[PDB]
Design an enzyme around this catalytic site. Structure first.
Site, PDB file in Angstrom:
ATOM      1  N   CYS A  55       0.847  -1.177   0.000  1.00 39.71           N
ATOM      2  CA  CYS A  55       0.000   0.000   0.000  1.00 39.71           C
ATOM      3  C   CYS A  55       0.893   1.241   0.000  1.00 39.71           C
ATOM      4  CB  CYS A  55      -0.891   0.000   1.225  1.00 39.71           C
ATOM      5  SG  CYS A  55      -1.426   1.652   1.643  1.00 39.71           S
ATOM      6  N   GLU A  56       0.650   2.177  -0.909  1.00 42.98           N
ATOM      7  CA  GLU A  56       1.530   3.362  -0.987  1.00 42.98           C
ATOM      8  C   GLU A  56       1.246   4.416   0.095  1.00 42.98           C
ATOM      9  OE1 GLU A  56      -0.821   6.031  -4.375  1.00 42.98           O
ATOM     10  OE2 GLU A  56       0.829   4.697  -4.961  1.00 42.98           O
ATOM     11  N   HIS A  57       0.089   4.321   0.729  1.00 42.29           N
ATOM     12  CA  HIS A  57      -0.313   5.251   1.763  1.00 42.29           C
ATOM     13  C   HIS A  57       0.300   4.923   3.119  1.00 42.29           C
ATOM     14  CE1 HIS A  57      -3.470   7.389  -0.565  1.00 42.29           C
ATOM     15  NE2 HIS A  57      -3.453   6.265  -1.256  1.00 42.29           N
ATOM     16  N   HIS A  58       0.444   3.636   3.405  1.00 40.78           N
ATOM     17  CA  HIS A  58       0.964   3.216   4.689  1.00 40.78           C
ATOM     18  C   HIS A  58       2.235   2.377   4.664  1.00 40.78           C
ATOM     19  CE1 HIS A  58      -3.348   3.990   5.829  1.00 40.78           C
ATOM     20  NE2 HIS A  58      -2.744   4.535   6.866  1.00 40.78           N
ATOM     21  N   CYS A  85      -3.618  -2.887   6.329  1.00 36.99           N
ATOM     22  CA  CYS A  85      -3.945  -1.611   6.927  1.00 36.99           C
ATOM     23  C   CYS A  85      -5.410  -1.516   7.418  1.00 36.99           C
ATOM     24  CB  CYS A  85      -3.614  -0.486   5.960  1.00 36.99           C
ATOM     25  SG  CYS A  85      -1.999  -0.674   5.205  1.00 36.99           S
ATOM     26  N   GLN A 128      -5.005  -0.549  -5.156  1.00 33.27           N
ATOM     27  CA  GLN A 128      -5.650  -1.642  -5.878  1.00 33.27           C
ATOM     28  C   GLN A 128      -6.199  -1.276  -7.242  1.00 33.27           C
ATOM     29  OE1 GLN A 128      -7.580  -4.450  -3.090  1.00 33.27           O
ATOM     30  NE2 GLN A 128      -8.666  -5.250  -4.865  1.00 33.27           N
ATOM     31  N   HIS A 188      -6.304  -6.024   2.771  1.00 31.30           N
ATOM     32  CA  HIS A 188      -5.394  -4.960   3.027  1.00 31.30           C
ATOM     33  C   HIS A 188      -5.064  -5.086   4.506  1.00 31.30           C
ATOM     34  CE1 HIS A 188      -5.585  -2.268  -0.647  1.00 31.30           C
ATOM     35  NE2 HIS A 188      -6.413  -3.248  -0.946  1.00 31.30           N
TER      36      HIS A 188
HETATM   37  N1  LIG Z   1      -8.981   3.680  -2.787  1.00 33.54           N
HETATM   38  C1  LIG Z   1      -7.934   3.199  -2.125  1.00 33.54           C
HETATM   39  N2  LIG Z   1      -7.623   3.729  -0.951  1.00 33.54           N
HETATM   40  C2  LIG Z   1      -6.547   3.178  -0.377  1.00 33.54           C
HETATM   41  C3  LIG Z   1      -5.758   2.148  -0.867  1.00 33.54           C
HETATM   42  C4  LIG Z   1      -4.709   1.938   0.071  1.00 33.54           C
HETATM   43  C5  LIG Z   1      -4.911   2.827   1.084  1.00 33.54           C
HETATM   44  N3  LIG Z   1      -6.042   3.568   0.823  1.00 33.54           N
HETATM   45  C6  LIG Z   1      -6.751   4.471   1.722  1.00 33.54           C
HETATM   46  O1  LIG Z   1      -6.103   5.713   1.791  1.00 33.54           O
HETATM   47  C7  LIG Z   1      -6.814   6.436   2.820  1.00 33.54           C
HETATM   48  C8  LIG Z   1      -5.891   7.400   3.519  1.00 33.54           C
HETATM   49  O2  LIG Z   1      -6.665   8.146   4.476  1.00 33.54           O
HETATM   50  P1  LIG Z   1      -6.115   8.940   5.680  1.00 33.54           P
HETATM   51  O3  LIG Z   1      -5.173   9.893   5.109  1.00 33.54           O
HETATM   52  O4  LIG Z   1      -7.147   9.501   6.493  1.00 33.54           O
HETATM   53  O5  LIG Z   1      -5.250   7.866   6.461  1.00 33.54           O
HETATM   54  P2  LIG Z   1      -5.459   7.063   7.814  1.00 33.54           P
HETATM   55  O6  LIG Z   1      -5.982   7.915   8.861  1.00 33.54           O
HETATM   56  O7  LIG Z   1      -4.223   6.309   8.066  1.00 33.54           O
HETATM   57  O8  LIG Z   1      -6.567   6.007   7.406  1.00 33.54           O
HETATM   58  P3  LIG Z   1      -7.241   4.792   8.172  1.00 33.54           P
HETATM   59  O9  LIG Z   1      -6.701   3.622   7.485  1.00 33.54           O
HETATM   60  O10 LIG Z   1      -8.667   4.889   7.933  1.00 33.54           O
HETATM   61  O11 LIG Z   1      -6.932   4.804   9.551  1.00 33.54           O
HETATM   62  C9  LIG Z   1      -7.476   5.375   3.716  1.00 33.54           C
HETATM   63  O12 LIG Z   1      -8.888   5.456   3.573  1.00 33.54           O
HETATM   64  C10 LIG Z   1      -6.925   4.056   3.164  1.00 33.54           C
HETATM   65  O13 LIG Z   1      -7.838   2.973   3.249  1.00 33.54           O
HETATM   66  C11 LIG Z   1      -6.147   1.568  -2.128  1.00 33.54           C
HETATM   67  O14 LIG Z   1      -5.632   0.601  -2.664  1.00 33.54           O
HETATM   68  N4  LIG Z   1      -7.246   2.172  -2.698  1.00 33.54           N
HETATM   69 ZN   LIG Z   2      -2.743   1.219   3.724  1.00 29.84          ZN
END
Ligand SMILES: Nc1nc2c(ccn2[C@@H]2O[C@H](COP(=O)(O)OP(=O)(O)OP(=O)(O)O)[C@@H](O)[C@H]2O)c(=O)[nH]1
Ligand SMILES: [Zn+2]
Ligand SMILES: Nc1nc2c(ccn2[C@@H]2O[C@H](COP(=O)(O)OP(=O)(O)OP(=O)(O)O)[C@@H](O)[C@H]2O)c(=O)[nH]1
Ligand SMILES: Nc1nc2c(ccn2[C@@H]2O[C@H](COP(=O)(O)OP(=O)(O)OP(=O)(O)O)[C@@H](O)[C@H]2O)c(=O)[nH]1
Ligand SMILES: Nc1nc2c(ccn2[C@@H]2O[C@H](COP(=O)(O)OP(=O)(O)OP(=O)(O)O)[C@@H](O)[C@H]2O)c(=O)[nH]1
Ligand SMILES: Nc1nc2c(ccn2[C@@H]2O[C@H](COP(=O)(O)OP(=O)(O)OP(=O)(O)O)[C@@H](O)[C@H]2O)c(=O)[nH]1
Ligand SMILES: Nc1nc2c(ccn2[C@@H]2O[C@H](COP(=O)(O)OP(=O)(O)OP(=O)(O)O)[C@@H](O)[C@H]2O)c(=O)[nH]1
Ligand SMILES: Nc1nc2c(ccn2[C@@H]2O[C@H](COP(=O)(O)OP(=O)(O)OP(=O)(O)O)[C@@H](O)[C@H]2O)c(=O)[nH]1
Ligand SMILES: Nc1nc2c(ccn2[C@@H]2O[C@H](COP(=O)(O)OP(=O)(O)OP(=O)(O)O)[C@@H](O)[C@H]2O)c(=O)[nH]1
Ligand SMILES: Nc1nc2c(ccn2[C@@H]2O[C@H](COP(=O)(O)OP(=O)(O)OP(=O)(O)O)[C@@H](O)[C@H]2O)c(=O)[nH]1
Ligand SMILES: [Zn+2]
Ligand SMILES: [Zn+2]
Ligand SMILES: [Zn+2]
Ligand SMILES: [Zn+2]
Ligand SMILES: [Zn+2]
Ligand SMILES: [Zn+2]
Ligand SMILES: [Zn+2]
Ligand SMILES: [Zn+2]
Lengths: 190, 187, 190, 190, 190, 192, 192, 192, 189
Positions: free
Chosen positions: F84-87, F155, F125, F153
């Site tokens: 996952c690029e976000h986490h 996360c 994804q 996921h």
């Molecule tokens: N459409 C899509 N979304 C994706 C991924 C991978 C990750 N994400 C999503 O990025 C969002 C980031 O939000 P945020 O900044 O508020 O973070 P954080 O407070 O840490 O969130 P949380 O996890 O709720 O605690 C989250 O909703 C996560 O699910 C993917 O493949 N496809």
């Molecule tokens: Zn993630």
């Protein structure tokens, strides 16, 4: 009525005692002394649906939600009695409906199953009665009912087909007219 | 509000213990009014939330229009008629219109409405409407399957009974092909 | 008693109405109007075990038999209430016993589960009360009781471990002393 | 033993008792679905109790052949009648034995289940009778019998515990004396 | 023990290290999808290692009550971090114990799993720490702990054995000394 | 594309960053279990992102055959492991690919190799799902392509919402798989 | 139709043929385990072909109810045991029957009795499937009938091709079950 | 077609090649476990490619019945063992065949024998699937044929991409199985 | 042992008996669908009883190679009930503890084919498989478990659709040492 139950209990017990003698058994042996009464009470409980009315069972549990979406109560355990052999037929009832601004209380769908299943029946009649009762109580866009049951008369005796199951279906209103609503219902009850 | 109402909830739970014939002074029940009150506040924590805070600006651009589903989301709610839990799973599908929601937010949206005194039908509709308003997608489909403990532990006592509710909005209602793809993919 | 239930029902309803207000809800909205009464009745039903005694539940269903073989009633659905959080814990009870001269009526083993489970409880106590009630009523060679339950307090809140299950076990008489008897019991309840 | 002449003579008495039960339940014995029910219910009940017409010697039919290793016939479908409520209890019988130079015909083990199950019974007696009949017919080193059954009196009424199952076990000869023989039997019937 | 003050002070250092990792992998930390990643990865890592902020005493929260039965909490979802590769290893923990006058709160057994699993670990250490913590807190007759986990370091990389699972076991007190107690535990956790 | 020389040059920078993370979490980088971690974590992360080192052309390796074949070809249950690029936490699952050839047929293994190019990256994804479908479309020019990705996921399970059973399903249907519902239905029936 | 008198008269001829088979296989018909085999094999074969002794009218036994029902009725998982006419080896499985009544509803057990009339004969799966559907159609005159037979042929598992998992599925759809795909789809969905 | 005389003549050449492979792998062809391996490996490879020795006409063996059945016939779960032509490594699975007869009905076992002719060769899944469908179409001239092959390719699990769960599904729909989606849907529902 | 010359001489007799059986059942052996049945039924019966032709030595084919448990489980087995001439089918699970010789894996299944392709009773078939392995290898012990559905109990007679017969033979250390037998029974699940 409950008065009818009390009055007919001795007649049912006398008939069950007579059955025990006619089968070659001894109604006086320890294991059979209370059997005429217990069999009579069990048969009254199996046919308690004759004592019920749709109005009492509904108990005003009709609500107003702006719902125009599919509602299903599936895997409702059902226990009925075959009217031809007086032997149980048991299974599951799956009910779906599309409300028309009147939404029924979830449990009332299972209570409606209890009114008709606790009687001497045939699967086809039981299936149709459940669908018609919901249609008349709610006036919805449509109702679908699926009953799946094992008939003990086909497994313990007669044809003795151990795995056989009877499936009956009733589709009213949009559940009959719109194949897409019927398909969504059948997909969601799997 | 939670801190201020906690003693009132505990007083009501202590009164319930006495009214049931129990002894609130017995070892096993001494802290029960407070623990039951805290549990009930946690079960209804969705009233503390707003869609905007929950979304947390997690809306991203996705030009290609593909079906997105988050299925098997564990859901725990409270029946508003009996104050007894109804639990199960939520399956959500949507077809984006250039905006895609953060995956976890679909489960957070389930948490806002499920953690309240509810009726399955309203819960199902609220999840679908929240996604529709937040993303403005081509359509949304929501399926909730739940065991209501009020139908198994009491009342009709139908051990295996399950309630399934469905809400289809936009193309999920208008196009049967989109709805069929969604229902096939959530199996 | 049922008289206690009628007298305490308005007090329970007042407490449930107060809970609705303290949670931020509107007790006057359609969906909540009857909730104080319905929640009060549901809680009385969940704790109906306080209205029962072992003697009434047994109903003299103790038969004299030359049976000195293992008897098991397994997969008895059980619904109880955690005394710490007033939240349900649900699962199954599996009971086994080796009769000496007295054999208990099959359904009474499930009724014994109902006397103790329909109370504010802790799983360990529940498990022990079922085993002790059978031991005192029948004086058998031994009793084994296994309770497997999902606690909603560990699933819907707190630790939130969705799959967690508590298994408690009580083994009395020959079920403790003879490992061969306990092994036969555990093998037959799978 | 009950004869086919006894069955013909008692059939009208059974039918009169079943017609009387239909009237005492509030039903209409003249309606189409019930017209033949007194006779069909009487025939079904005679079939459910046909085990009173049989003897072990006729059932064995000299099918004893001339091996000291374990023989098991498991998953034998069993359909019996509760003698307390006259309601079916159904499930499976698993039989194991260690021959002593005489091996019984495989089908006769299922036929022995039929003699005793097609009667008004209690699970414990049924389990013991099957084990004793095999012991007396073959004189083997030992016999083990396990019966698992759903009692409809515990599912369709009374306690209404939908998943409850009764498991009874009888171990004779080496199946009681040697835990290793009993363990091999219980492992092989899974 | 680590605190929320240490967490907030170290968060910018963790974010700087994660931003550096993004650049060193050939990625662009300025692209839309990676802008908040240094902070979100840092927060996720301190949540995965939140076990260093806890102590057994605080986690137990005096939930020790005043039994002769085996108590098991099984299928506790477990999520840990491999210390050698900083990659998750996830699975289930099954705990059993025989109390000695002190019974632990059910949820605390899962809370004990959380203290040790939310750290950089090796499966063997995690298994032993859970068993030792219960042993020291309760002083029971014995404790048994079974951990089953998929290591992502063996599936997503390295040997790439998709189905491989690590199972570790720790048996203390009567769970080690008495094979009958250990066998009952292993049978009941299936 | 990232090279093996880039990997060697950046390995010490990645190990320094992982060592810094160990200290910032309250851990002791000098304890036995953590001594080699800065390097092992760095190598694992380079392996998880090895897709940046690859090209569609090299991966295909001319494994395109000719045929009078106009029938459905599916490679299902392809194990997929992504980040996952976000986490910077894994998301894992399966990829099911279907296509209707237009005289050119791809080598069976290449469909799984295409999954590897894109999954071994920092992703989302939805992007992963379209990249696999677009790569097959451009390489073969078929009548159509269908791609279904189902993933857990971590996360959403080990943290955040902590919904243990949650799964994300993404679908991309191109060419006849989008235009003809009968082709899409045959694909979805055969991947069950 | 074959009678019980025909069975008594032909039993010694069947036993003589089975005794001859024992000798022709190299076996000893005088050994203890084979002494009664000519008679038991002959009785078993008469039982396997007892369907030749039956007629639809006797089997139905007036169990046709005139209580309206305009909805689908199914009796599924009917255990079926037949004999291949080409090899005289059993083929066994299940029959699933569905029909839409036209004011006449058949007794549930009679649908399984109809399976018994035709399956207890020397057969071919295709003919067996068709006979069950035709018998129901002619007895009830319904809007339509659907019959699905799934069977393991022992001639394909114990010998010949020896494909241990092979199963033959035959289907017959008459009236609305053939003309209306929606009726047929409801039937196939409900038999799963 | 390859003959039994060709097999006897080529067996020593195959054994010489397998003995050479043992030496080229670093093994000792003289050790007890490998002494007969050149001959056993040669015989196994001839058995795996025995389909080259067969013709459709001999395999059918006039098992075509003129019973006018106008209903769906399926033989499913036919175990299939083939050999990949690109790597000489097995690919194994199941074949599911359906057809709608016109005036001719094929013998049940011949559908499995047709699978054996083509699968016991050096193949590619796509070609194998098409060959089975074309052979049935030409032999019976039915209204249509559907063939589904599902297989695990050991070249994708034991090596290369090493995707342990990957499966290839190929489908061929001819005649009414292609033109009528309702016939194809009934076939796909009945093979589950 | 039954020879291929015996097969050629005895095939006609079996076919004439099957033709006679067709007529005695009320069928017409002249109808199109039965013309080839006497010959096909005769050939099928010879195949079902091909085990009388086989000797252990030929079946082993010197596949004996030079002290831990070896199991070949889930061996599909197809036999014929000698009392009714109807199939009984299932699985055979074989375990053994080698002494100095180890048998070829496939030979354990080939030994099942020698005895199962005969007119049998489950008990005898189970014992014959264990004795053949014992005599061929002289191992420390052998265990054989046969699980089978008898069609004579499901398609007729008692008609108990789910019934299964399980027979067991434990020789040498499999009989004498309960730990060896328990390891075998646990590993065949
Ligand atoms: N459409 C899509 N979304 C994706 C991924 C991978 C990750 N994400 C999503 O990025 C969002 C980031 O939000 P945020 O900044 O508020 O973070 P954080 O407070 O840490 O969130 P949380 O996890 O709720 O605690 C989250 O909703 C996560 O699910 C993917 O493949 N496809
Ligand atoms: Zn993630
Ligand atoms: N459609 C319908 N039919 C129903 C029930 C319940 C029962 N029945 C059916 O009444 C028929 C009675 O026939 P009969 O008189 O010949 O009896 P009997 O000789 O004992 O029969 P058998 O059982 O064959 O031995 C049977 O066919 C039975 O199945 C139902 O729900 N739906
Ligand atoms: N449609 C809908 N309905 C819902 C819920 C939750 C609950 N309910 C339903 O309210 C009704 C209340 O009825 P009542 O007043 O008669 O109560 P009570 O005697 O206790 O009933 P019962 O339980 O049957 O004994 C019940 O029918 C219950 O099922 C939901 O999500 N959706
Ligand atoms: N042995 C036993 N223990 C039982 C029950 C029922 C409940 N309990 C346990 O009492 C403990 C109370 O602790 P506490 O004060 O810290 O509460 P609270 O913060 O809400 O806890 P938590 O849930 O962790 O959030 C918990 O551990 C709970 O599990 C049972 O049957 N057997
Ligand atoms: N051991 C044994 N017991 C058997 C049977 C069959 C039945 N029974 C049991 O006789 C008891 C009689 O009780 P009773 O008089 O109070 O009846 P009733 O009010 O109707 O009961 P209930 O069902 O609770 O409503 C019950 O407990 C029943 O289970 C058997 O095989 N083995
Ligand atoms: N006993 C135990 N061992 C554990 C963990 C967690 C991890 N490990 C293991 O440490 C070893 C380190 O070796 P190494 O330096 O050679 O690494 P590396 O080349 O990257 O390895 P590889 O994965 O083969 O590519 C590996 O074998 C790894 O599995 C645990 O919980 N318990
Ligand atoms: N359509 C249909 N076909 C049926 C049955 C029952 C059997 N058959 C089939 O008749 C064919 C006979 O051919 P044949 O002469 O070549 O015999 P034989 O050498 O012994 O064949 P084989 O078994 O392959 O060794 C076989 O193909 C067999 O399957 C049925 O119900 N429906
Ligand atoms: N359409 C189709 N394709 C088939 C088979 C059988 C095999 N193949 C495919 O031939 C390709 C050959 O490519 P190549 O030269 O690059 O080899 P190699 O480096 O060893 O590849 P790889 O395995 O990735 O290491 C591979 O993609 C393989 O999958 C089939 O039935 N249908
Ligand atoms: N121990 C053993 N027994 C075996 C076989 C195979 C068959 N048999 C058994 O021989 C007996 C013959 O009895 P009989 O003469 O009375 O015949 P018949 O009236 O037709 O019987 P039935 O079938 O009940 O109708 C049956 O009991 C049958 O099961 C085996 O492997 N092991
Ligand atoms: Zn009936
Ligand atoms: Zn409720
Ligand atoms: Zn609690
Ligand atoms: Zn009873
Ligand atoms: Zn690691
Ligand atoms: Zn055949
Ligand atoms: Zn290959
Ligand atoms: Zn037999």
């Amino acid at each position: 009525s409950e008065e009818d139950n009390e009055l007919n209990l001795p007649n049912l017990a006398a008939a069950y005692s007579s059955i025990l003698s006619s089968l070659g058994e001894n109604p006086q042996r320890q294991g059979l002394l209370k059997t005429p009464w217990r069999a009579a009470s069990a048969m009254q409980f199996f046919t308690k649906g004759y004592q019920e009315t749709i109005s009492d069972v509904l108990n005003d549990a009709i609500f107003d939600e702006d719902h125009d979406e599919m509602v299903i109560v599936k895997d409702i355990d059902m226990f009925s009695m075959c009217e031809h052999h007086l032997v149980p037929f048991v299974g599951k009832v799956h009910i779906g409906y599309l409300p028309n601004k009147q939404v029924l209380g979830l449990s009332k769908l299972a209570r409606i199953v209890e009114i008709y299943s606790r009687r001497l029946q045939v699967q086809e009649r039981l299936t149709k009665q459940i669908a018609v009762a919901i249609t008349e109580a709610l006036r919805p866009a449509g109702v679908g009912v699926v009953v799946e049951a094992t008939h003990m008369c086909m497994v313990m005796r007669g044809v003795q087909k151990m795995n056989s199951k009877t499936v009956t279906s009733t589709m009213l209103g949009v559940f009959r007219e719109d194949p897409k609503t019927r398909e969504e219902f059948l997909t969601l009850i799997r």
